[PDB]
Amino acid sequence: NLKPVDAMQCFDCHTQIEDMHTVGKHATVNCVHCHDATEHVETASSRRMGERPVTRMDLEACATCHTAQFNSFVEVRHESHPRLEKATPTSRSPMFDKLIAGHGFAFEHAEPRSHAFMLVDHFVVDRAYGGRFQFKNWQKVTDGMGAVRGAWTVLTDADPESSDQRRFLSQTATAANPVCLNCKTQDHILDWAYMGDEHEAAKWSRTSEVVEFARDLNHPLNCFMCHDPHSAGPRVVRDGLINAVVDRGLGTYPHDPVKSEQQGMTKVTFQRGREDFRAIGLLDTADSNVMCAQCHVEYNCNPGYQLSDGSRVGMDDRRANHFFWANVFDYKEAAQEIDFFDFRHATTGAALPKLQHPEAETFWGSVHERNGVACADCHMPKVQLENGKVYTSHSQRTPRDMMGQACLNCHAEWTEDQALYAIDYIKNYTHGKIVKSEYWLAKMIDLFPVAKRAGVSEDVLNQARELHYDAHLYWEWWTAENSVGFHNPDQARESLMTSISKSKEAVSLLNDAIDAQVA
């Protein structure tokens, strides 16, 4: 059984914790729930840590007093089909392999499934660790509760004796690096300096051996990613997000200065040896738009190249951990501002961006966002009980499972079937334009080898490569983004029509040049 410690002892040295803990809704929650600091207190001085206290990062540390929220979070949605490859005719991107050739996602890119699995799925996907990690057997894929208890309770490592990234099966890649883990877990929150910069007090950084780092990590989506454990107040902890909102002064809502001021973020910094070490962003309000934007954004979390001179941009570079914080029509400018692209297309040779699930940036300026609706209203609504204490569902999933709470309370004019029909109208229309964008991109890509072999000039090929950048960006945003247009239907429409226009322009350019060589 837990025995309480005297927090006044701690507060003598930890004045920021004192100011947060004594004022918030955890003022009565004793430190012993999350820290074992007995030897620390015996050996610390006001400026030296002494013995390092143990800090619990397991979700069960919160589940004892908050069982309803924990249980709602860990539920597995079995209807969210698992390990389902997107590069198939029945999924999001039928022509993905041709369009993405040259990039590591060609090795595997599955649809998302329930949050319980995020860390294990990151470890086992074919593009990440060369197939080094597997579930202990194929039965363990069902075990959401086990994954939450810890990745290493359900996974195996093919070679515990080595720590290098290498292929263990032929059709795998080794794309994973330490930046990735910041959107899968924050078990490393006390061991990673802000942005992953080198730091004397940091065990792990952008340049660490990712296999060694992985072995130290266990829990998905820690509860404290959105809730300060000391004040219980709303926050973010993701470095890249704090960097965009606060350091670069872009604001929580870059298109709306007023909403940014009402619903802002305050950066709180913690030091080691009196040098800045790590930071959090305290939110003015419990704003799920910004909480979910810790991960559901377009980002760099990988090495790349410079647009200017084509030189390698390695993990050591700050740009390898970056939130662009830009909508699809501002993205090219944002990538130019850091002089960066992701890969060269294997067929066309074009410098190209790689887009990641940009839900937050897509949602900006949409009808729902403009009306003050937030991710949680549709994806984590309040539970409705005939007789009960209301709490917020933490099962972050499609509103199709809870249409009464997620849609119909606001849309009183609709039945469930009518609201579903409105969603499908948007998704069907947008998916049609995605498929057409892919048809035109593929037609363009396939002309590159024909043009090369016909002796078309490098100048013409480079003109087509510049068009490929835009044709790609204005398509891939929408196969990356998970709502199939629902979050912003007009923007999806405008972007996908632009993609098709760019590809058609490139097709015309190449066809004419090929024909001129033939004559």
Ligand X SMILES: O=S([O-])[O-]
Cite the annotated binding site for heme by residue number. Answer: 10, 13-14, 26, 31, 34-35, 40, 62, 65-66, 115, 180, 183-184, 223, 226-227, 230, 292, 295-296, 368, 375, 378-379, 394, 407, 410-411, 487
Using CA atoms, how far apart are residues 195 and 321, in angstroms rounded to an integer?
7
Contact with ligand X (CB under 6 A) among 6, 9, 16, 346:
16
> E strand or H helix at 352, and its extent?
strand 351-352
Does 217 bind ligand HEC (CB under 6 A)? Our answer is: no
Does 14 bind ligand X (CB under 6 A)? Our answer is: yes
If you ran DSSP here, which 8-state letter would residue 177 be given?
-
Q: Are 133 and 125 in contact (CB under 8 A)?
A: no
Give 204's strand partners. 192
Nearer to ligand HEC, 179 or 444 (CB): 179
Look at residue 220 and give the partner it binds from ligand X, Ca ion, a copy of itself, none, a contact being a CB closer than 5 to 8 Å depending on partner kind. Answer: none
Does 495 bind ligand HEC (CB under 6 A)? Our answer is: no
Does 387 bind a copy of itself (CB under 8 A)? Our answer is: yes
List, as residue ranges, the binding site for Ca(2+).
298-299, 354, 356
Query: Structure tokens of 365?
Result: 């300026």
Nearer to a copy of itself, 258 or 385 (CB): 385
Positions in 342-361 near Ca ion (CB under 5 A): 354, 356
Does 337 bind ligand X (CB under 6 A)? Our answer is: yes
Give how many residues touch ligand X by CB under 6 A.
Answer: 12
Look at residue 337 and give the partner it binds from ligand HEC, Ca ion, ligand X, none, a contact being a CB closer than 5 to 8 Å depending on partner kind. Answer: ligand X
Does 483 bind ligand X (CB under 6 A)? Our answer is: no
Look at residue 28 and give the partner it binds from a copy of itself, ligand X, Ca ion, none, a contact being a CB closer than 5 to 8 Å depending on partner kind. Answer: a copy of itself
Nearer to ligand HEC, 29 or 158 (CB): 29
Query: Which one of 152-160, 164-172, 253-261, 465-473 is the stretch in contact with a copy of itself (CB under 8 A)?
Result: 164-172
Give how many residues touch a copy of itself by CB under 8 A.
Answer: 95
Give how many residues touch ligand HEC by CB under 6 A.
Answer: 105
User: Which residues make Cβ contacts (< 8 Å) with residue 121, sequence separation at least 6?
Assistant: 110, 113
For 515, how many CA atoms within 13 A lie in the half-sphere containing its CB? 6
Q: Spell out the alpha helix ranges (H) of 293-389.
A: 331-337, 359-363, 367-370, 375-379
- Which has the closest alpha carbon to 236: 297, 191, 177? 297
Does 384 bind ligand HEC (CB under 6 A)? Our answer is: no
State CA 170 to chain mean position distance.
27
Sign of the alpha-carbon dihedral angle for 177, 178, 183, 185: positive
Q: Are 219 and 150 in contact (CB under 8 A)?
A: yes
For 162, how many CA atoms within 13 A lie in the half-sphere containing its CB? 10
Does 389 bind a copy of itself (CB under 8 A)? Our answer is: yes
If you ran DSSP here, which 8-state letter would residue 286 be given?
-
Q: How far is the CB of 468 from ligand HEC (least distance, A)?
A: 23
> How many other C-beta atoms can be found within 10 angstroms of the C-beta atom of residue 462?
12
Contact with ligand HEC (CB under 6 A) among 145, 410, 442, 460:
410
Using CA atoms, how far apart are residues 393 and 379, in angstroms rounded to an integer?
9
Nearer to a copy of itself, 307 or 422 (CB): 422
Amino acid at 186: Q
Q: How far is the CB of 270 from ligand X (least distance, A)?
A: 5
Owner of token pair 């300026």: 365
Q: For binding to Ca ion (CB under 5 A), which residues are involved?
A: 354, 356
Q: For binding to ligand X (CB under 6 A), which residues are involved?
A: 14-17, 248, 250, 270, 334, 337-338, 356-357
